Design a protein around this ligand. Structure first.
Ligand code: HEM
Length: 470
C-alpha cells in the first residue's frame, strides 16, 4: 500500500537514521536499496522520493494537478504568508491567478526582447571589470562574486528597470545580506525538530521571531527602495515600464493585494538570482577543466558571428554548441537537483502505492539526468551528446530524463530568461578570456556540495581570466 522504505522508529521516524541532509546523492543510495519510489518519515512528515522518468512524468504531468501543490512548514509560512506568494502556494485559484498575472510582465518573448540588451551589457561589464582586475590574469578571481552583481542587475532591470552600480553599492550589499538571511533561515536544519515533532513547536518561538524580523526588514527594503519608486514613476510617467509596474497595476485593479505584490518580489529574489548563478559558475568551472570544449566554443562564435563580434541573445539559436554546453551544464551539474517539493492535497497514488495527503514529493531530477542506465556515460561533461544521441532533448523537459526546469503546470516559467542569460554570459566570457585554473593547479576543484535545495560547487571557483590579446 505505502511505498517501501526503511522502517522508522517512534516519534523520530527515519530522522535519526538518515539525518538532516537529504540530497540527490544519499537519496540515490536509498533508491538503490528500496527502488524507484520510497518513503521516509521525518518525524510526522511523509517524504516520497521518485527516481525514474516514468514517475517524474506521473508527478509532473499525468497527475500534475493531484501533485501540483507545494509543501510548507512554520518557517516558509512566515516568509510566504502561508502561500500568498507564487512558488509556495498550493494548487488552486490563487496559484492560477498569480501564474497568469506574472506571464506578460516576466515570462514572454517580448520580455526577452525588451531586456536582452541589458543582459548583454551586464555581461560585458563583467568582462570589463574582470579584464581590469590585476588578480584575474595572475592568481585568478572568485568570479561568481562579480557574476552575482550581474544576476542582480539582470533581474532588477526586469523587475524595476534599475541596477546596482558596483559590488560596493550600499543598497546592493544590504539587499544581498537580507536575501542571504532569508534563505539561510528557511534552509537551516536547526528548526527541523519543531517541524518533525510538532508538539515542540513552542520552542521555535525565538527562531520564528527571527524569521518575522527578517521578513520585516526585507519587505521594508523592497517597499522603500523599489516598490514605492515605481508607484511614483508610474504616476508621473503615467505608464507601465517594467515588470513590477504590471504587478502594481494588477493591485490597482483589485486583482491582488499589496502583500501579493511583495511576495512576488520575495519569490523572484530567491528563485531567479543565485539559482542562475550556480549554473553559470558550474559552466565556467567545466569549461576551465575541458579546454578542448572551451576552444571549440570560442571557434563556433568566431565562425558564426565573426571575430570580435559580441554574442547577443538572437545569436543563441545559431550557436548550437553554446546551447549544448548550457544544457550539459544543467544536466551534469544540475544545481536545483531535487526541483522544488511537490505535494498532494488529497490521498493519491504513485506506481500503485498509496500516498498520504500532504506528503512531500521529491523528484530526483539530478539522478534522472545522470542515470548510467539511461544516458551514454553521463559522468562525462560532453556537450556533444546534445548534438548527437540526445540531439532532440531540450531543457524544457520534452524528455523526462532531463527536467532541470520541471515539466507541466508547476514548471519553471523563468526558463525563458535563464537560458539566454546563461548562454550570453558564458559566451561573452569565452569570447574575451582564456578560462584557466590558478597557477598551482591543473583543474578547478569541481567537488559537489549537494543539499536538499541546491547542488553548488562546494568551493567557489577561483578562475584565471587571461585576456585573449594578452
Ligand atoms: C538556471 C536557472 C533556473 C533553474 C534551473 C530553475 C528551475 C526551477 C525548477 C526546477 C522549478 C520547480 C519545478 C517543479 O516544481 O517541478 C522552478 C520554479 C520556479 N521558477 Fe525557476 N529556475 C531557474 C531560474 C528562474 C528565474 C530566472 C525565474 C524568474 C525570473 C524563476 C522563477 C520560477 C518560479 C516563479 C517558479 C515557481 C513556479 C510555480 O510553482 O508555479 N526561475 N524553477
Amino acid at each position: 500500500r505505502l511505498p517501501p522504505g526503511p522502517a522508522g522508529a517512534p516519534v523520530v521516524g527515519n530522522w535519526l537514521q538518515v539525518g538532516d541532509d537529504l540530497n540527490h546523492r544519499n537519496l540515490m543510495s536509498l533508491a538503490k536499496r528500496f527502488g524507484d519510489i520510497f518513503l521516509l518519515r521525518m518525524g510526522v512528515r511523509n517524504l516520497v522520493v521518485v527516481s525514474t522518468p516514468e514517475l517524474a512524468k506521473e508527478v509532473l504531468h499525468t497527475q500534475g494537478v493531484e501533485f501540483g501543490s507545494r509543501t510548507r512548514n512554520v518557517v516558509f509560512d512566515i516568509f510566504t504568508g502561508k502561500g500568498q506568494d507564487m512558488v509556495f502556494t498550493v494548487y488552486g485559484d490563487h496559484w492560477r491567478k498569480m501564474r497568469r498575472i506574472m506571464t506578460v510582465p516576466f515570462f514572454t518573448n517580448k520580455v526577452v526582447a525588451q531586456n536582452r540588451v541589458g543582459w548583454e551589457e551586464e555581461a560585458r561589464l563583467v568582462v570589463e571589470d574582470v579584464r581590469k582586475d590585476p588578480r584575474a590574469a595572475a592568481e585568478g578571481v572568485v568570479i561568481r562574486r562579480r557574476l552575482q552583481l550581474m544576476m542582480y542587475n539582470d533581474m532588477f532591470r526586469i523587475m524595476f528597470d534599475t541596477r546596482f552600480e558596483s559590488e560596493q553599492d550600499p543598497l546592493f550589499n544590504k539587499l544581498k545580506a537580507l536575501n542571504a538571511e532569508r534563505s539561510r533561515l528557511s534552509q537551516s536544519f536547526e528548526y527541523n525538530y519543531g517541524d518533525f515533532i510538532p508538539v515542540l513547536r513552542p520552542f521555535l518561538r525565538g527562531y520564528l521571531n527571527r524569521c518575522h524580523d527578517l521578513k520585516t526588514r526585507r519587505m521594508k527594503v523592497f517597499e522603500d527602495n523599489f516598490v514605492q519608486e515605481r508607484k511614483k514613476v508610474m504616476a508621473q510617467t503615467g505608464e507601465i515600464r517594467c515588470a513590477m509596474d504590471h504587478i502594481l497595476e494588477a493591485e490597482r485593479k483589485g486583482e491582488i493585494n499589496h502583500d501579493n505584490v511583495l511576495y512576488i518580489v520575495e519569490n523572484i529574489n530567491v528563485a531567479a538570482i543565485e539559482t542562475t548563478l550556480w549554473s553559470i559558475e558550474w559552466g565556467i568551472a567545466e569549461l576551465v577543466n575541458h579546454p578542448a570544449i572551451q576552444s571549440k566554443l570560442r571557434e563556433e562564435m568566431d565562425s558564426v558571428l565573426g571575430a570580435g563580434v559580441p554574442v547577443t541573445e538572437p545569436d543563441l539559436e545559431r550557436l548550437p554548441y553554446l546551447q549544448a554546453i548550457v544544457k550539459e551544464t544543467l544536466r551534469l551539474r544540475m544545481a536545483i537537483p531535487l526541483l522544488v517539493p511537490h505535494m498532494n492535497l488529497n490521498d493519491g497514488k504513485l506506481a500503485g502505492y498509496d500516498i498520504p495527503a500532504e506528503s512531500k514529493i521529491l523528484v530526483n531530477a539530478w539522478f534522472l539526468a545522470n542515470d548510467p542506465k539511461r544516458w551514454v556515460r553521463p559522468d562525462e561533461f560532453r556537450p556533444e551528446r546534445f548534438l548527437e544521441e540526445e540531439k532532440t532533448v531540450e531543457a524544457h523537459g520534452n524528455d523526462f530524463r532531463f527536467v532541470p526546469f520541471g515539466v507541466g503546470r508547476r514548471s519553471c516559467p523563468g526558463i525563458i530568461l535563464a537560458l539566454p542569460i546563461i548562454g550570453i554570459t558564458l559566451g561573452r566570457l569565452v569570447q574575451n578570456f582564456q578560462l584557466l585554473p590558478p597557477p598551482g593547479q591543473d583543474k578547478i576543484d569541481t567537488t559537489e556540495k549537494p543539499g536538499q535545495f541546491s547542488n553548488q560547487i562546494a568551493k567557489h571557483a577561483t578562475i584565471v581570466c587571461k585576456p585573449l590579446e594578452a
